[PDB]
UniProtKB/Swiss-Prot annotation, chain A:
Subunit structure: May interact with ClpP.
Domain UVR: 233-268
Role this protein plays: Required for growth at high temperatures, probably by acting as a chaperone during heat shock and targeting heat-denatured proteins for degradation by ClpP. Required for biofilm formation. May act as a chaperone regulating CtsR activity.
Organism this protein belongs to: Staphylococcus aureus (strain NCTC 8325 / PS 47)
MF term (GO), any: ATP hydrolysis activity
Protein name: ATP-dependent Clp protease ATP-binding subunit ClpC
Record keywords: ATP-binding, Chaperone, Nucleotide-binding, Repeat, Stress response, Virulence
Positions bound to ATP: 50-57, 361-368
Induction of its expression: By heat shock. Transcriptionally regulated by CtsR. Up-regulated by heavy metals such as Cu(2+) and Cd(2+), but Zn(2+) and Co(2+) have no effect. Forms part of an operon with ctsR, mcsA and mcsB.
From Swiss-Prot, chain C:
Subunit structure: May interact with ClpP.
Organism classification: Bacteria, Bacillati, Bacillota, Bacilli, Bacillales
Spans through the membrane: none
Family, as annotated: Belongs to the ClpA/ClpB family. ClpC subfamily.
Superkingdom per UniProt: Bacteria
Protein name listed in UniProt: ATP-dependent Clp protease ATP-binding subunit ClpC
Full protein: residues contained: 1 to 69 of 818
Amino acid sequence: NTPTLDSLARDLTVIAKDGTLDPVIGRDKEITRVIEVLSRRTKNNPVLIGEPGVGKTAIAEGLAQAIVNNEVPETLKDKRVMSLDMGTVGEFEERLKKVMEEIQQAGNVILFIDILKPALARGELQCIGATTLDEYRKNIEKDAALERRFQPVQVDEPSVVDTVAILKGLRDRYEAHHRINISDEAIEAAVKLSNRYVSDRFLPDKAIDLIDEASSKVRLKSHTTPNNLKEIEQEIEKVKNEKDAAVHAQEFENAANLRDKQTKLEKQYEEAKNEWKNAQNGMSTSLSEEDIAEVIAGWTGIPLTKINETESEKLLSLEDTLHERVIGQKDAVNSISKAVRRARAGLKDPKRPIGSFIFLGPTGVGKTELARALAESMFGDDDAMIRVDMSEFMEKHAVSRLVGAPPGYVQLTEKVRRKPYSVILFDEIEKAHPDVFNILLQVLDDGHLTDTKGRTVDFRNTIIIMTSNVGAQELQDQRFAGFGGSSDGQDYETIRKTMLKELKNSFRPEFLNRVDDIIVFHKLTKEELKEIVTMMVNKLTNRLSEQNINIIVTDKAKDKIAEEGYDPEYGARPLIRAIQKTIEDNLSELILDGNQIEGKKVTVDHDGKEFKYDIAEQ
Amino acid sequence: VVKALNTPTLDSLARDLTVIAKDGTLDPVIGRDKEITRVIEVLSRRTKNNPV
Amino acid sequence: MLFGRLTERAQRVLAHAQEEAIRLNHSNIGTEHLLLGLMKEPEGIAAKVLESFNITEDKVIEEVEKLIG
Ligand SMILES: Nc1ncnc2c1ncn2[C@@H]1O[C@H](COP(=O)(O)OP(=O)(O)OP(=O)(O)O)[C@@H](O)[C@H]1O
């Protein structure tokens, strides 16, 4: 019975014999793979290759449990499974020899791990590894003796349908504890919302983590006292205290009356409790899909208004959001709106990125503003954007930075792994190392990468937008080409074709084949800045909602301030400086003058020379 | 005025809080209602019911 | 546990102190008012304590009125 092995490690077949834990669900293929590898004459030592946390222990648990259920074949029939943890690591080597001798003598003991080279060379130990890929390629692959004795097995997270099956399998184990009726529609919504945002710890702990507050909220709300039993309980408590005081007062004349009142209150409380509990038991604790959405709203900080969507009106409202946040140049909005919906529906290849637009045009037009608006209207998070600057990626040694530090030395992949649903933006792409272009082409074509540690990152749900400043000199010449007008009257397709023809001269012909649509921004005119000033004023008023102050700016002031920093090359940069140094300078003094304008209305008017401020009621 | 007037193992190995709080000696915890509600909501669950 | 343990007579003492504060033109409910509120409750256990100590109602009222302003 291998007493030495049973004392120096933890036996799993004993725990699985009682079956006190939840059964391993969704790992029906890993068990068959393990029992098939263990039956092979050569390389009979499977290794659970994968990142920690994906359920490597569950594989061993299921393998040990299969013995009790008589599901293992004759090759692995009535054979115990023993796992030796890394916490038990001279005198250390004196125990493993006895353990392997007992394993060889018994013939039914299967070793499991998270000196031994002669043991594995002869195949006397059918150990099953569980180390990560990084350590497996660092301590096992370097040895030739163990190279032909260990068969790597790919163990990773299951599919979404497998996760739904796992959740439905253990439904009773959760419903029988707190007596909560879990609806079928809540399982799919929960598994969708968990994978939508929580994608850091992989499966299955990123999908089962939602059922901790969603049901508890309604359970606690329905378990409280609706101002019926609390008053009776307080009356009973005060009557009991009064009776105790009377008993300690040696005044038993009122003791009988107090006892009778206490008995009557106890009877009334019992009747009320019975009639309340009958009504409570008359209905079941059904679960709705709103609780999971509320829980995930607090888990990630996303407002509930964005999560509570059917993913059908988002595409329609994308154009409205882009037109509201970005003033003018609707051609880019209409061009990007058509391309994203095709990929979202499924017309485009799922592995390829949803968006592959390229931003072109003069600086200061607001490309970053449009990117942020798109990210907010598509994902709902403004800060879920990763920006990589190509200014530092000019040498050959810089290619080993975004993919990760190679083993021996000590970015983008690490950040994008935690946020697969993020918008990726690049700057100065026209000046970058050639290997970066190859990496970007591989991302656009294959749809995924792999770091130096062997972990595979995902780029299927990532939108790649590259901003290039080349070709800006061509657009500005077209505006002044004809007197009395510009190129705005020309069709957008002609300008797009000319910019594409000029773009492929500097870039690779095959690099532009993956671009869904070339994005070209227009110029800023006098009328466009008037609405930008209005938007800035509205944003300033919104930021002053706490002080309850209404600020209105006349169009004359907007026109006067628009020309203060009008420059096509700079863009909208001088506008912020002009706004801050004209109105806000006087506003701050009024705020600090003992709340002079608190709870009032401020009006900005340009009389021709200065900006007179009017203070009145709000 | 004077003349005219249960799991015991854990009790000795630890300290009981609700006994002292029953007598009305501890300072009233005010403003921590959100934390108390969060703790009681997390604690009442089959899985992941150990708040930290 | 402030109001969760006071008896009916305990609240009567407080009410007597509060009503005596108004009559005496005192805006502060001092300790001199609780004594008067207790003296006007000849039903509690404390009533026997003062009765057995030759403590009446009229003497304490004037004694506390002389001390206070
Ligand atoms: N139509 C518009 N309405 C309001 N603000 C606008 C509009 N167009 C541009 N802006 C503003 O112009 C600013 C320009 O800054 P931004 O960083 O976005 O510039 P950019 O043109 O993308 O260039 P760069 O890549 O050099 O940073 C933005 O912050 C945005 O608020």
